[PDB]
Amino acid sequence: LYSRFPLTWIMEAADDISYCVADLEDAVEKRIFTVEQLYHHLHEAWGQHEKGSLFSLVVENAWEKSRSTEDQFFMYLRVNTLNKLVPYAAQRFIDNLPAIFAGTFNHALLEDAECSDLLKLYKNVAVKHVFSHPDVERLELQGYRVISGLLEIYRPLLSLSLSDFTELVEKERVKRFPIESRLFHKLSTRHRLAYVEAVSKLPSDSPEFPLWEYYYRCRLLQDYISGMTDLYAWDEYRRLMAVE
Amino acid sequence: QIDFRKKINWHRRYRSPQGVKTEHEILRIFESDRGRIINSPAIRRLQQKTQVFPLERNAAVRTRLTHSMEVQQVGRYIAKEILSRLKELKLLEAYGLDELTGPFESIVEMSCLMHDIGNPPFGHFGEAAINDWFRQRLHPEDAESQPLTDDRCSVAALRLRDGEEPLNELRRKIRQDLCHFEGNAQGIRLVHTLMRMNLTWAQVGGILKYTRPAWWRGETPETHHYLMKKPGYYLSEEAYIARLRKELNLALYSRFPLTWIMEAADDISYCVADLEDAVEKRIFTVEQLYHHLHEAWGQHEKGSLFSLVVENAWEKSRSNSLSRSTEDQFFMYLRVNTLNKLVPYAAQRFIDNLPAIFAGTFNHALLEDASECSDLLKLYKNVAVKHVFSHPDVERLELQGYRVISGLLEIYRPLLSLSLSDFTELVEKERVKRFPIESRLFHKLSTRHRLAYVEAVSKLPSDSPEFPLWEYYYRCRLLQDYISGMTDLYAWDEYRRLMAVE
Amino acid sequence: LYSRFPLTWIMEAADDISYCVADLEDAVEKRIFTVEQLYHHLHEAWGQHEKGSLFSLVVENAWEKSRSSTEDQFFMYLRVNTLNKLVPYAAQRFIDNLPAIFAGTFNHALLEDASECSDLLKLYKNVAVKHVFSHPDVERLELQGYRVISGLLEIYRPLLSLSLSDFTELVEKERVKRFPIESRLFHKLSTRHRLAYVEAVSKLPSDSPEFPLWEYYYRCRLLQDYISGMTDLYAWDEYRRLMAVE
Ligand SMILES: [Mn+2]
Ligand SMILES: [Mn+2]
Ligand SMILES: [Mn+2]
């Protein structure tokens, strides 16, 4: 109980690496700053400078390769990073393999205490310059309302009695609840199917049965929404707000 | 004693110049102010702020900017008139003006320009949507008397704490100040605390239209009724306002002698322009309009100012040569006709009542109610009300504006619906864990109003029991500044963007 | 003949000055580069750095004032700095060369090429050209504008691609049988430029052999007036409307 699969740690690592550098490449691509501007933000961020550190070995190294640009810079920066970080995590894994095999090891392959530092450096720069950009933040806020509003559009299905809701599940066409009918039809056939199946496995007699139904009802709604793409959710929000 | 040397204060608030200066040096300081104003983005914003009619695909219609330029030329004429009349009376040197001629005039023009500068996106409708949004959240009426057992205020700190505290008076003032937003008051706030222009005292005097504090709750002084008609400044400016009075030699609730000139110009340019635009938007013909004006006058005499202005301009339009359009000629001479009779009146009125005007105690307008002049203006206004201001496209936009601002204010409610400890946290760390929406929403706020909030806050004593009340007053002010700062377009665009339809 | 009004030179000068600095302010406002980035582009552009030059007196001066809004203060004092040195120069130049200016024969500008003043302006211009005027959003709109006008001119080609006898016919009768497109297109023209055409035409002698040539000259003028009279928005709006996309 509470033990992790030994390979999960490897997958996690790669995600933690790829994580920033790619968005940083895209940042210069969206013209947020130059590749030169970025290098200077990274120099500023390191502070405790030594001529043999991983900064020199990776970032300083990739900067020199670019001069006698952007492509070469990111291309070798990526290389430089993997070429030092991958061996570390590969080792870390092997080194702490018993606890990892157990899936009890309470740490990451790229810890906190030089590799973790380099990553953190990318992250800080990304936070302070990229993640902070208004167009990003605008969209982030936009997203929030889209989902909140969409959830409210589907509130009528939740703001209902079991006896009524179940009725809608059997008869597709219900007299008194036509909005709720149509709204339930909007739900994807797979999440719909899944709800019914989880429900049919419960004992009718049980006092917990109505609680379960609701848990599942909400799950069903959650599945629909989470299942959507950024586009589909936005499109639907407008369509159900009646602006198309 | 009347001495304009004492009223035309060429000194500034910060980095202020001092010591002697020639006629030329002085002119240059006032000319400096012009450049400051004219290059201000706050002045550019006005080409995107609506004036009566919606911002149409063709600039044929006047915007807040184009109207204010028109007002400024009127102001120029009046000021120039006062001066010429006075030189003919030889009183120019006598009133300490012989060397402040140009400055006097420039101040008028610049104040004229800057009228409406502090107005919100949807003007008077914006004011409403702001004040109303704050009223449902503060209920300043619940503060007027004794602490109500059921205070409708949504804010814990601003709710009148029971049978004790002089802090109860601070709560009263904050609630009234925030719920009584006025463009003129915001204008003062803007040029100093927001735009950080650092203008000559004299200039800032000219844009101080009313002497009423925003926090005022009671009946208006009988003797100062007119001067306190609307609020002129906020609680946030009270300090600076005191500084202004002392610099310009003004008693509590006393007006700057030139403000009266600027006011007058805006009372004239006011309608005629929209009436021109009305015929342009085809609401009625120029002929139809003339007949609405004839209908409106009623008590017709063959030598009245109607005959001298409107009847006169109507005759000029018919068999108008110069290959000029009927409408063009009509409005062109109607404008002329008006100024040609009204400007001298107000110019005289000023000179006639100069001691009380110099004092800034004069409880009346240059074109006051009884005057045949005030009547002519009212005539234009009536016609405009009954036919132009009543048009559906106008009214549609008026209603539209209201919702845009109200909705926008609600979008920013989360920042206000917060604890000081939390809000302050967001001010220091730009990235806050638990409040991500609030974070991003606070980033949406403009860097200048943001800066201003922090500055007002850093000047307060941490220890003080009033400190949390102040923070909130300022917090609201900050939000108000953002919104009021927007153009009709930006506010609408943002409303849609934040409602997620783009 | 070919002599200029003595005051025109003053107005001209004001435009040569205001010309760039404002767009440069707007450039940093549209985030094209920082105020710091711009200062460095100006340092790069000066090249021949020496003296208590006007660069030091204006740009270097304004840069120092900005350090302890930064941008506002920078442009505010940069503007000041410029006027404070350039205005006196041109004011002098005017007075100095007043006889030739009064004559309106003076074959030069108040801020002429060799003056340190002209150099400062040119500096702003170069930076604006190389960084601001070159931006894609600018250029996009510039190209867009071209098509809008060209297309609009083509939409109105039918009125020009006509005989005098036919065109005149359209001027008298507002409704013409055989030319309905041309009718409606002529109605689209603004009442003022329309009026002006007729007036210039009615002033010509009917009998004259030059009369048909004049009619055409005026016809084109009339079209030109309509277009030139439009705002960027109205011309674009009309282009779309007449291309049928609204
Ligand atoms: Mn990932
Ligand atoms: Mn007005
Ligand atoms: Mn120009």
Coordinates of N, CA and C in Angstrom, one line a residue, chain B residues 335-409:
Chain B
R335 N -22.8 78.3 -34.8 CA -21.6 78.2 -33.9 C -21.1 79.6 -33.6
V336 N -20.7 80.3 -34.7 CA -20.3 81.7 -34.8 C -21.2 82.6 -34.0
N337 N -22.5 82.7 -34.4 CA -23.6 83.4 -33.9 C -23.7 83.3 -32.4
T338 N -23.6 82.1 -31.9 CA -23.6 81.7 -30.5 C -22.5 82.4 -29.7
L339 N -21.2 82.0 -30.1 CA -20.0 82.5 -29.5 C -20.0 84.0 -29.5
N340 N -20.3 84.6 -30.7 CA -20.4 86.1 -30.9 C -21.3 86.8 -29.9
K341 N -22.2 86.1 -29.2 CA -23.1 86.8 -28.3 C -22.8 86.3 -26.8
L342 N -22.5 85.0 -26.7 CA -22.3 84.4 -25.4 C -20.9 84.6 -24.8
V343 N -19.8 84.5 -25.6 CA -18.5 84.8 -25.2 C -18.4 86.2 -24.6
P344 N -18.8 87.3 -25.2 CA -18.8 88.6 -24.6 C -19.4 88.7 -23.3
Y345 N -20.6 88.0 -23.2 CA -21.4 88.0 -21.9 C -20.6 87.4 -20.8
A346 N -20.1 86.2 -20.9 CA -19.3 85.5 -19.9 C -18.0 86.2 -19.7
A347 N -17.4 86.8 -20.7 CA -16.2 87.6 -20.6 C -16.4 88.8 -19.6
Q348 N -17.6 89.5 -19.8 CA -18.1 90.6 -19.0 C -18.4 90.1 -17.6
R349 N -19.3 89.1 -17.5 CA -19.7 88.5 -16.2 C -18.5 88.2 -15.3
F350 N -17.4 87.7 -15.9 CA -16.1 87.4 -15.2 C -15.6 88.6 -14.6
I351 N -15.3 89.7 -15.4 CA -14.8 91.0 -15.1 C -15.7 91.7 -14.0
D352 N -17.0 91.7 -14.3 CA -18.0 92.2 -13.4 C -18.0 91.7 -12.0
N353 N -17.8 90.4 -11.9 CA -17.8 89.7 -10.6 C -16.5 89.2 -10.2
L354 N -15.4 89.8 -10.8 CA -14.0 89.4 -10.6 C -13.6 89.3 -9.1
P355 N -14.0 90.2 -8.1 CA -13.5 90.1 -6.7 C -13.9 88.7 -6.1
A356 N -15.2 88.3 -6.3 CA -15.8 87.1 -5.8 C -15.2 85.9 -6.5
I357 N -14.8 86.1 -7.8 CA -14.2 85.1 -8.7 C -12.8 84.8 -8.3
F358 N -12.1 85.9 -8.0 CA -10.7 86.0 -7.5 C -10.6 85.3 -6.2
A359 N -11.6 85.5 -5.3 CA -11.8 84.8 -4.1 C -12.1 83.3 -4.3
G360 N -12.9 83.1 -5.4 CA -13.3 81.8 -5.7 C -14.5 81.3 -4.8
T361 N -15.3 82.3 -4.4 CA -16.4 82.2 -3.5 C -17.7 82.4 -4.2
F362 N -17.7 83.1 -5.4 CA -18.8 83.4 -6.2 C -19.7 82.2 -6.4
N363 N -20.9 82.1 -5.8 CA -21.7 81.0 -5.8 C -22.6 80.8 -7.1
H364 N -22.0 81.3 -8.3 CA -22.8 81.2 -9.6 C -21.8 80.9 -10.8
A365 N -22.5 80.6 -11.9 CA -21.9 80.3 -13.3 C -21.8 81.6 -14.1
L366 N -20.9 81.6 -15.0 CA -20.7 82.8 -15.9 C -22.0 83.0 -16.7
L367 N -22.6 81.9 -17.2 CA -23.9 81.9 -18.0 C -24.8 81.3 -16.9
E368 N -25.4 82.2 -16.1 CA -26.3 81.8 -15.1 C -27.8 81.8 -15.5
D369 N -28.5 80.8 -15.1 CA -29.9 80.4 -15.3 C -30.9 81.5 -15.9
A370 N -30.9 82.7 -15.2 CA -31.7 83.8 -15.7 C -31.4 84.5 -17.0
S371 N -30.1 84.4 -17.4 CA -29.5 85.1 -18.6 C -30.1 84.5 -19.9
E372 N -30.5 85.4 -20.9 CA -31.0 85.0 -22.2 C -30.0 84.0 -22.8
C373 N -28.7 84.1 -22.5 CA -27.6 83.2 -22.9 C -27.9 81.7 -22.4
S374 N -28.1 81.6 -21.1 CA -28.4 80.3 -20.4 C -29.7 79.7 -21.0
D375 N -30.6 80.5 -21.4 CA -31.9 80.1 -22.1 C -31.6 79.5 -23.5
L376 N -30.8 80.2 -24.3 CA -30.4 79.7 -25.6 C -29.7 78.3 -25.6
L377 N -28.9 78.1 -24.6 CA -28.2 76.9 -24.3 C -29.1 75.8 -24.0
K378 N -30.0 76.1 -23.0 CA -31.1 75.2 -22.5 C -32.0 74.8 -23.7
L379 N -32.2 75.7 -24.7 CA -33.0 75.4 -25.9 C -32.3 74.3 -26.7
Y380 N -31.0 74.5 -26.9 CA -30.2 73.4 -27.6 C -30.3 72.1 -26.9
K381 N -30.1 72.1 -25.6 CA -30.2 71.0 -24.6 C -31.5 70.3 -24.7
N382 N -32.6 71.0 -24.7 CA -34.0 70.5 -24.7 C -34.2 69.7 -26.0
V383 N -33.8 70.3 -27.2 CA -33.9 69.7 -28.5 C -33.1 68.4 -28.5
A384 N -31.8 68.5 -28.0 CA -30.9 67.4 -27.9 C -31.5 66.2 -27.1
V385 N -32.1 66.6 -25.9 CA -32.7 65.6 -25.0 C -33.8 64.9 -25.7
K386 N -34.8 65.6 -26.1 CA -36.0 65.2 -26.8 C -35.8 64.5 -28.1
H387 N -34.7 64.7 -28.8 CA -34.5 64.1 -30.1 C -33.3 63.3 -30.3
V388 N -32.2 63.8 -29.8 CA -30.9 63.2 -30.0 C -30.5 62.1 -28.9
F389 N -30.4 62.6 -27.7 CA -30.1 61.7 -26.5 C -31.1 60.5 -26.3
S390 N -32.3 60.7 -26.9 CA -33.4 59.7 -26.9 C -33.3 58.7 -28.0
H391 N -32.4 58.8 -29.0 CA -32.3 57.9 -30.1 C -31.8 56.5 -29.6
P392 N -32.5 55.4 -30.1 CA -32.2 54.0 -29.7 C -30.7 53.6 -29.7
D393 N -30.0 53.9 -30.8 CA -28.6 53.5 -30.9 C -27.7 54.1 -29.8
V394 N -28.1 55.3 -29.3 CA -27.5 56.0 -28.2 C -27.8 55.1 -26.9
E395 N -29.0 55.1 -26.6 CA -29.6 54.4 -25.4 C -29.1 52.9 -25.3
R396 N -28.9 52.2 -26.5 CA -28.5 50.8 -26.6 C -27.1 50.7 -26.0
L397 N -26.2 51.6 -26.5 CA -24.8 51.7 -26.1 C -24.7 52.1 -24.7
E398 N -25.6 53.0 -24.2 CA -25.6 53.5 -22.8 C -25.8 52.3 -21.8
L399 N -26.8 51.4 -22.2 CA -27.2 50.2 -21.5 C -26.1 49.2 -21.5
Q400 N -25.5 49.1 -22.8 CA -24.4 48.2 -23.1 C -23.2 48.5 -22.1
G401 N -22.8 49.8 -22.1 CA -21.7 50.3 -21.3 C -21.8 49.9 -19.9
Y402 N -23.0 50.1 -19.3 CA -23.3 49.8 -17.9 C -22.9 48.4 -17.6
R403 N -23.4 47.4 -18.3 CA -23.1 45.9 -18.2 C -21.7 45.6 -18.3
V404 N -21.0 46.2 -19.3 CA -19.5 46.0 -19.5 C -18.7 46.3 -18.2
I405 N -19.0 47.4 -17.6 CA -18.3 47.9 -16.4 C -18.7 47.1 -15.2
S406 N -20.0 46.9 -15.0 CA -20.5 46.1 -13.9 C -19.9 44.7 -13.9
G407 N -19.9 44.1 -15.1 CA -19.4 42.7 -15.3 C -17.9 42.7 -15.1
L408 N -17.2 43.7 -15.5 CA -15.7 43.9 -15.4 C -15.4 44.0 -13.9
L409 N -16.2 44.8 -13.2 CA -16.0 45.0 -11.7 C -16.2 43.7 -11.0

